[PDB]
Amino acid sequence: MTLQEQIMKALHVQPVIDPKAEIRKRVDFLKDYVKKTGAKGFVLGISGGQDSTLAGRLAQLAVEEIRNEGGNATFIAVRLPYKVQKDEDDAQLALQFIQADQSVAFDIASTVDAFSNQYENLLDESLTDFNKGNVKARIRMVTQYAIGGQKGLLVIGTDHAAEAVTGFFTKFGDGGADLLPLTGLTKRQGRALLQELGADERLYLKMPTADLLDEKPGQADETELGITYDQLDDYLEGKTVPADVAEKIEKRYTVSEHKRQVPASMFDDWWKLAAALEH
Amino acid sequence: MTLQEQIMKALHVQPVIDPKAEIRKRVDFLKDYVKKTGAKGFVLGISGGQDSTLAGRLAQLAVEEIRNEGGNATFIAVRLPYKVQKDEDDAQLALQFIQADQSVAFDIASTVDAFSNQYENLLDESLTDFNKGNVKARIRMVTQYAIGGQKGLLVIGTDHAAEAVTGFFTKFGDGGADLLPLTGLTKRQGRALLQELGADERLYLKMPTADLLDEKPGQADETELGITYDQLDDYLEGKTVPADVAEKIEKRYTVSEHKRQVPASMFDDWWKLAAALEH
Ligand SMILES: Nc1ncnc2c1ncn2[C@@H]1O[C@H](COP(=O)(O)O)[C@@H](O)[C@H]1O
Ligand SMILES: Nc1ncnc2c1ncn2[C@@H]1O[C@H](COP(=O)(O)O)[C@@H](O)[C@H]1O
Ligand SMILES: [Mg+2]
Ligand SMILES: [Mg+2]
Ligand SMILES: [Mg+2]
Ligand SMILES: [Mg+2]
């Protein structure tokens, strides 16, 4: 059980998939969970990026099916830009593909800026571009839980294998959610579900980006990772990759275990077994 | 096992404790985790309440010890009121007991209100007192994580058994954190640790409250729960309780399972096993 193999199991990566069937199980998952909770439906932030675009469509399929089955459900797609979003066009295009029951825009700037003006003031230092970026992510979570709490909806998270392995998300930010329909899928697999669902090619060929920085907006995930998604997917799918690559992915993975676990207490082992951990 | 024995085991509750030793193990836990993450210390929000008062003291004891061991550490106590806290005086008393390396006051009103005014404005509706309250708890998390990211500090969480069995905390609010030094302690026991540390009686005799609502500020937990901490502690420590009590406590436990687990995905079984979840 090599480390790479241990990661594949833990992240529920299926080395080979039938897109149609995957879409089936994932849409089935949203329905079964929402049914167990008695929630009125779902809420998800659509960024124009591949993952939310895909999670979004799976959500609309779920609620429509819940309706045809004789139930009451709804999906609200929510645009959460900071001021004018660089790729607003792309988000709109994703919205055109999703066909959400409802769609609404909530600029988070007033909230974020209120917080950072307050921080700099009272703490006599300004938030670095990075930390400020994490504020944006977290405020996006607050917004989705606000709408969800008011309308009785579950918050869909877009975490998948490609982001989980490198722990590429903000703790309690986009990482905080109730339901994860993309769990286990590699980046290229996610694209394969979009193709099967007939998504405009522009929607899955777009450059993955968290777009949080004020000075490097739209920054390529890969540019921050130092690892391309071809590699990550290769690794996750069980293929072989340059020892150079494997090792980097494996260290990023082990140092981010805290992001894939609930808060550590003295009764947990994962942090004890761990060589190190970086926050 | 009886459902009760399952909760006690799952929540790591010890029916009998030696206050002196519990303090040693818990301070030892803060030191180990932090030492394994290269973090520069901790950061915690001090409410004036019993939990943050205890966890706070354990954190100051940990950083002093780390420094004494030749290391480098710091503890920041952060007051996080909404406008003006009704019990600010109690927080001042707690701060005088904690004797934290540093302390700051960060009013979350401006940030929270910026959000509310934006919600009402864009969703032609207004946040209920309950949901706004959750926004505050969640903004409190944003603030701690901001300070933690700027100064390289870990975020201490004050969750414990008495609060976990009922899932009495905000998901991704105070529930969001990196380290849980009070895990497994009952409310009763937490006061014993405070007495052992020699806290002013007023610090552990105070009325437990999340104080999140505008219309009913300083609301007693017990009033919202319908279960006194005296009952919750009996249940958790293994003692006997009226059937209707145990029953109410066990239902709140199973329905809030989702708050004690990472976001659910189709590969998780806890939600499948559950008769019903409640968000
Ligand atoms: N500008 C945005 N508008 C709406 N949702 C967003 C935005 N940015 C991020 N999100 C949410 O955050 C998730 C993760 O983003 P990312 O860091 O690019 O992987 C997305 O899948 C969305 O649900
Ligand atoms: N007014 C406040 N100021 C600072 N920290 C707070 C405040 N309210 C809540 N917290 C944090 O949230 C935790 C949970 O509070 P509670 O809901 O009363 O159990 C506390 O133990 C603190 O760490
Ligand atoms: Mg993504
Ligand atoms: Mg993105
Ligand atoms: Mg508390
Ligand atoms: Mg309190």
Of B12, B123, B172, the CB nearest to A172: B172
Fold of A1-279: Rossmann fold (3.40.50)
Q: Which residues line ligand 2 (CB under 6 A)?
A: B 44-47, 49, 51-52, 79-81, 85, 140, 158, 169, 174, 209-210
**How were these coordinates obtained?**
X-ray
Query: Is the minimum CB–CB distance between B106 and chain A shorter than 8 Å?
Result: yes
Q: What is the resolution of this structure in A?
A: 2.4
Looking at chain A, which residue has its C-alpha nearest residue B149? Answer: A131
Burial of A254 (0-12, 13-18, 19+ CB in 10 A): middle
* Interface residue A9 vs chain B (CB under 8 A): no
Burial A42-72 (b: 16+ CB within 10 A, else e): bbbbbbbbbbbbbbbbbbbbbbeebeeeeee
B209 is known to lie in a ligand binding site: yes
Is residue B186 a known part of a binding site? no
User: Which residue has the least CA distance to atom 11 on ligand 2?
Assistant: B45
Which-ligand-closest: CA of B137?
2
Residue of B nearest to A115 (CA): B111
Q: What is the dihedral of CA A217, A221, A222, A228, to 10 degrees?
A: -150
What are phi and psi for residue A34, nearest 5 degrees?
-60, -35
Separation CA A168–CA A259 (nearest Å): 9
Q: How many CA atoms lie within 13 A of A247 on its CB side?
A: 3
* Beta partners for residue B43, in sequence order: B76, B155
Identify the three-state secondary structure at position A130. Answer: helix
Distance B187 CA to ligand 5 centre (A): 9
Contacts of A266 in chain B (CB under 8 A): 25-26, 28-29, 181, 183
Write down the domain spans for chain B: 1-279
Q: Which of A244, A48, A224 is nearest to A234 (CA)?
A: A244
